[PDB]
Design a protein around this ligand. Structure first.
Ligand SMILES: C[C@@H]1[C@H](O)[C@@H](C)/C=C/C=C/CC/C=C/C=C/C=C/C=C/[C@H](O[C@@H]2O[C@H](C)[C@@H](O)[C@H](N)[C@@H]2O)C[C@@H]2O[C@](O)(C[C@@H](O)[C@H](O)CC[C@@H](O)C[C@@H](O)C[C@@H](O)CC(=O)O[C@H]1C)C[C@H](O)[C@H]2C(=O)O
Ligand code: HEM
Length: 390
């Protein structure tokens, strides 16, 4: 297969696939065939990813968005792209000025007692019947979701439908099912905005109303935030928990020392996914990078965790070392595109690991890790299940 194809099934969890390892050793920027069947440029190395994150010729913009080369087939992902390059710039700037104040240090610090309290409640439900239990579906997802709902302003009576609607939102190669969850989610969130415009509450939707006069527009905006943080946080709770099970003496040191726990969270972010953490861009003009020229209109695949195994940056990247320092991973991106939820994601993760392992020090897998499976055909795909006992 020339160019190499990315849809090479799914590698085992917590391991860098042979395909991606050879692509990275081959060149910093590689032409590949995407899961959707089109052609794209995979950025494989740390320095080149950083450079492209700071190059204003990469954008969520294309002269013909409907016909542009695709990474995967998903209409919700397609909503990030507009056909006017000036409009793409101003929309991106606007979105960052809307969202950045919601994740200030004061706000995340102030939310933290609430985050810890939500973790405690989810844990009670997770352990209520004793072991074994599914860490993914009965702790990681409900905890990740309850935090996002508390911050965004989704009441309890609607959180039950969210996991379902958000699941069908991420489905690949089924535009009709993505449209269903899109309909259901956009209608739910914009109705909340209509209410909170009249009766403001301490949540993000209420504060978005003060700068976004359209309730309709708050639908996709809020949906973006939820989808950006739900599976991303949940899957890192899952995989970080496995990494800790596999490295008990490092887990013991992280539990005894908060600074070591912060380092451990960073090492889990660096290494848990081990490639495949791709978001797309398009070139709006020719971009020379490494020894190739990305052409205007071309698809560019930014893989934010493949670069965390770049041997020219990380010594022994395949080893889990919570004391790794410095730890310049790019899991949250960089620059003008840097993940706005990163401070919240970090609090969620250290809250989860701290609570889980102090309450359940015997946590272990029910079956060998080789038997875990990632859901297929899913944007932001996580484990089907994570059975644990304690
Ligand atoms: C300007 C507009 C307009 O006015 C309005 C009218 C339009 C709004 C448009 C809304 C549509 C939003 C787009 C969502 C797409 C998500 C794709 C996720 C893909 C996830 C990928 O997954 C893969 O999939 C493959 C198939 C599998 O083979 C792989 N093994 C793997 O699983 C990679 C996963 O990514 C990360 O997860 C983080 C991502 O979430 C981030 O945090 C959000 C980034 C992005 O979402 C930012 C937006 O979301 C912010 C949004 O808010 C913008 C916004 O409204 O602007 C408003 C103001 C973390 C996971 O570790 C990583 C992972 O899994 O490795
Ligand atoms: C461990 C969990 C998470 C990871 C690994 C992660 C990763 C990322 C990455 C790599 C990007 C850059 C995407 C690109 O350049 O196209 C990004 C952007 C973004 N993330 Fe996250 N994220 C996480 C959690 C969250 C959470 C919890 C939220 C919201 C509560 C969030 C909201 C956003 C937003 C709004 C953007 C768009 C920034 C922009 O377009 O300039 N993320 N995230």
């Amino acid at each position: 297969t020339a160019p190499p194809s990315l849809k090479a099934e799914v590698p085992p969890v917590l391991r860098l696939s042979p395909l991606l390892r050879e692509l990275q050793s081959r060149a910093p920027v590689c032409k590949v065939r995407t899961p959707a069947g089109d052609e794209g440029w995979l950025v494989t190395r740390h320095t080149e990813l950083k450079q492209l994150l700071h190059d204003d010729r990469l954008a969520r913009a294309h002269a013909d968005p409907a016909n542009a080369p695709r990474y995967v087939h998903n209409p919700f992902l397609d909503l990030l792209v507009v056909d006017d390059f000036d409009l793409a710039r101003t929309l991106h700037a606007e979105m960052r000025s809307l969202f950045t104040p919601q994740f200030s240090a004061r706000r995340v610090m102030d939310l933290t007692p609430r985050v810890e309290a939500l973790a405690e409640g989810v844990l009670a439900h997770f352990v209520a019947q004793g072991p074994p239990a599914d860490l993914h579906n009965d702790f990681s997802l409900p905890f990740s979701l309850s935090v996002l709902c508390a911050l965004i302003g989704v009441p309890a009576e609607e959180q039950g439908k969210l996991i379902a609607a958000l699941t069908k939102l991420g489905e690949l190669d089924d535009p009709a099912r993505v449209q269903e969850g899109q309909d259901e989610l956009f209608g739910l969130l914009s109705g909340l905005a209509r209410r909170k415009r009249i009766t403001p509450e301490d949540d993000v939707i209420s504060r978005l109303c003060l700068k976004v006069p359209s309730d309709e527009r708050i639908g996709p905006i809020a949906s973006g935030l939820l989808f950006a943080g739900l599976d991303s946080v949940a899957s890192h709770i899952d995989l970080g928990t496995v990494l800790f099970i596999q490295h008990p003496d490092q887990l013991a040191a992280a539990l005894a020392d908060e600074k070591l726990m912060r380092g451990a969270v960073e090492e889990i972010l660096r290494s848990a996914k081990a490639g495949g953490s791709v978001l797309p861009r398009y070139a709006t003009a020719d971009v020379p990078i490494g020894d190739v020229t990305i052409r205007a209109g071309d698809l560019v695949l930014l893989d934010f965790t493949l670069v965390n195994f770049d041997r020219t940056v990380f010594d022994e990247p395949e080893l889990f070392d919570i004391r790794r320092a410095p730890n310049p991973h790019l899991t949250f991106g960089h620059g003008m595109w840097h993940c706005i939820g990163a401070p919240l994601a970090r609090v969620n993760l250290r809250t989860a690991y701290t609570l889980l392992f102090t309450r359940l020090p015997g946590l272990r897998l029910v079956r060998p890790v080789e038997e875990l499976r990632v859901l297929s055909g899913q944007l932001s795909a996580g484990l089907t299940e994570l059975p644990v006992t304690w």
